[PDB]
Amino acid sequence: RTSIEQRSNAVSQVLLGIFSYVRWPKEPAVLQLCVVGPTEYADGLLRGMVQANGRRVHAERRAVDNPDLGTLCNVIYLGVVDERERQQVFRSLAGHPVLSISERGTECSVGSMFCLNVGGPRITFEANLDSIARSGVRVHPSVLKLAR
């Protein structure tokens, strides 16, 4: 088991944790996760995951310029994108109840609601409170206790 694999599984676990604080307006029977753009640590997600409640999380890769990310995805896990691609993605998510989490995120000021920092002894993440507030999903504030 490589360190990328260990981390990938941790990313899976961190994500499940975050998911538990999120509520969608209409809760789907199967939670759709979309991995968008190049990622290092999404392989665990892509094998599939199940929430504590029993809801299955189905994950697949979708393209940065898929115009239907907002209706096809309940959760976005965002990899390497440039500014024009990131804007494209979030224009698709606009007005839809979509949880967004980015794999990197030096700053986490614009774009995703939560930004993982995966390198390092443990995975940490930051919260973008403004993204959270414009996101369409409800987020229990206790999740911030799990952030950095």
Cite the annotated binding site for GMP by residue number.
Answer: 23, 138, 140
Taking contact as CB under 6 A, which single stretch among the options 9-17, 40-48, 81-89, 136-144 is the one that binds ligand UEG?
136-144
Q: Which is nearer to ligand UEG, 23 or 56 (CB)?
A: 23
Q: Using the rule CB under 6 A, which residue among 56, 67, 141, 148 binds ligand UEG?
A: 141
Task: Give the closest residue to 50 by CA, choosing from 6, 101, 11, 12.
Answer: 12
Q: Which is nearer to ligand UEG, 23 or 91 (CB)?
A: 23
In 106-120, which positions are buried (b, 16+ CB within 10 angstroms) versus exposed (e)?
eebeebbbbbbbbee
- Per the structure block, which two tokens stand in for 107? 């700053």
Q: What residue ranges bind its own copies (CB under 8 A)? A: 2-5, 8, 37-40, 43, 46, 60-63, 79-80, 103
Least distance from its own copies to the Cβ atom of residue 67, Å: 12
- Per the structure block, which two tokens stand in for 132? 């959270």
Taking CB under 6 A as the rule, does residue 101 contact ligand UEG? no
How far apart CA 46 and CA 102 sit, in angstroms, is 15
Taking CB under 6 A as the rule, does residue 127 contact ligand UEG? yes
- Per the structure block, which two tokens stand in for 67? 């115009």
Question: Binding-site residue total for ligand UEG (CB under 6 A)?
Answer: 6
Cα distance from N-terminal residue to C-terminal residue, the chain: 27
DSSP 8-state code for residue 144 = G
26 has which bridge partners?
A: none
Q: Which is nearer to its own copies, 41 or 90 (CB)?
A: 41
Contacts with ligand UEG, residue ranges (CB under 6 A):
127, 132, 139, 141, 143-144
